[model samples]
Target: TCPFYKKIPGTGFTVDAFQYGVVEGCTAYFLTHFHSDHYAGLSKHFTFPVYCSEITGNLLKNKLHVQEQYIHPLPLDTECIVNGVKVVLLDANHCPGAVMILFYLPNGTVILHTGDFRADPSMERSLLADQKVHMLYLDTTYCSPEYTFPSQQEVIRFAINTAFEAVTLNPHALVVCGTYSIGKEKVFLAIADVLGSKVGMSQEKYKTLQCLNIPEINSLITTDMCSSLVHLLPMMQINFKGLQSHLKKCGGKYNQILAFRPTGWTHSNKFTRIADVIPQTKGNISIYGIPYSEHSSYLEMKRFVQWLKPQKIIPTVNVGTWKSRSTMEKYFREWKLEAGY
Candidate 1:
């Protein structure tokens, strides 16, 4: 879901606020990633200057047909001045082009806007260590204690092991992994590497991946369906019904199909802790809803807030309504007090 568009305090810059027609006093736009929810209203007709990472800039130019002059690709971990305001980009660890933006306003205020990131251990070293951050625009996608899940590394290993086990049980099984156009690539890529096979996808998705500039991407993909037993499909097609139709099209090349639907929603807080959730199965089609996500978990969010200790925290997700916003605010106060801030 998209959140309300808001500008940074004491600055004329806006981050991931393209959906609203045009803000009155905004001077420039900042895009954190190429996700649709963030780039909703952006089009070729957009007139304002856009600042983003180099990979995101390539996506804007090739995918959205944005003019070259309008897109400014900033270098990662480097300080650049825009209209007298110092800005920096850090790796988001969410997707290929995703970045966490850091801003130092001329009015003695510092802000860090995490545009949908997974709070990894290395953030402590990469982020501000001694500099006091005044405001933090957080991606509270899973900010509640009820939204707990495993790490990305564990989930990817589980997926690779599950797929390998299924195929060993049935020699003619097809491995289908649910994925988006830009995200959830690590799961399938790891599976391919472990299984020693190529990945199959549509021509359009392949073209989109080309814009990512991932090393050895050209060798990892195959156009011929028969060249690889592992194939990638849209998240919508991971269900049993969709797999049935796809299996029928194969005409007996594969007897059974094992599909993995990677997402954090599959994990339920009803349980204490989870390494892997349960799987669903039909007659010949089996589907596993892998608890994989690019967004940070509940505990990760808490650790980030407590460690960063920003003067003010502004939630970027679940802020459309007062009820949800207040719930998040309660957690913010609890964590801040626990941190002795």
Candidate 2:
């Protein structure tokens, strides 16, 4: 939720300033992705070494004025030393360049922090999954029974099929969806590829995708929104009222608008049911909330915790111990949901 910089004694270094800002006097820093929440207080005058993936390094350099001397670009699935700490970085599979930080200590005790990930149990794909981790900092975003929703794969298919229906339903209408600035590139890219259409994005996103260099995919800024069959608005601008305001900005630029809010939270309000896709229509807009999340559900979290069996589990959020012990209980300590490990 916010940044945490805990000092694990004798490990020779502090933790990633992945949340708030660069920890004051923090020897070496770590970054998962460019999400504003994960990177809150960085600035031009910031002076420190940042260990991150190659792609993220470029972003930091281009957008944030991170100097070359301070940028340590680590390759995927590789181990590197930062301020004498042995660190192995793993793909978090949440957003591009997001990584899980694994610290190997001389005492054979491993400390792991999965920055942000889709804990769908296939996470055993981790290079260090077989090893024992003494301490773990997990991404407990969806750590509740009520959070039972389909995986991103299932939800994306639903969004795509629903978007296709919306497009076919009204050939003149504008189809648009909400996506984080960086995370849902896969979904949008996949939707575009499957439908044989190009997506529209912001100028900043235009450059980021251009860095990917995938020639088959095409994209442009949103000024020509009506030209493209489907337009993509930022994740922050995907609501009914927000879209309504945008519609006014469009000002009859189109006939109809189908807004898709692809997320798992929609399942909680019963807007949609188990493995189902039902869209909510308000006035001139139809909004479909798909269960597309990168965090673990209660069951998936249980599976993962049982796999690690860490000595202690630290809840990322400061909502107090209940956050870790309530839903965290059924996962590790209680005598339930231990089938997979």
Highest TM-score, which number?
Answer: 1
For all predicted structures, in order, the TM-scores are: 0.95, 0.85
The runs of at least 3 residues in candidate 1 whose Cα sits more than 4 Å from the true structure, single-residue gaps closed, are 1-5, 267-269, 272-276
Which lDDT value does model 1 have at 243? 93
Candidate 2, residues 1-341: lDDT per residue as tens digits? 32343455455354445444544546776777777767666656777777788878887878777788888889878777777778888877787777878888777778888877766566676677768888877777776667676667776777677667666777667777787656666666666556656777667766766544344544433335545666778878887788888777666767777877666565464355535556688887878766666666767777777776777666563336665557565545562344432
Q: List CA RMSD, all candidates.
A: 2.0, 3.4
On the 0 to 100 scale, the lDDT of residue 59 in model 1 is 89
Q: What is the lDDT of residue 190 in candidate 1?
A: 91
Q: Model 1 over residues 1-341: C-alpha lDDT tens digits?
A: 32333577778888888877787778989999999988889888888999999999998998899989899999999889987789989999898989998898888889899999999778988847758888899999988887877777778878888888888888899999887758888888898887788898887787788899799998888777787888988889889889999999877999998888876654364563445455788888888777777898889889988999899898888887899989999999999888998
Looking at model 2, the pairs that clash are: 3-19, 3-20
Report lDDT (Cα) of residue 56, candidate 2: 80
Pick the lDDT winner: 1
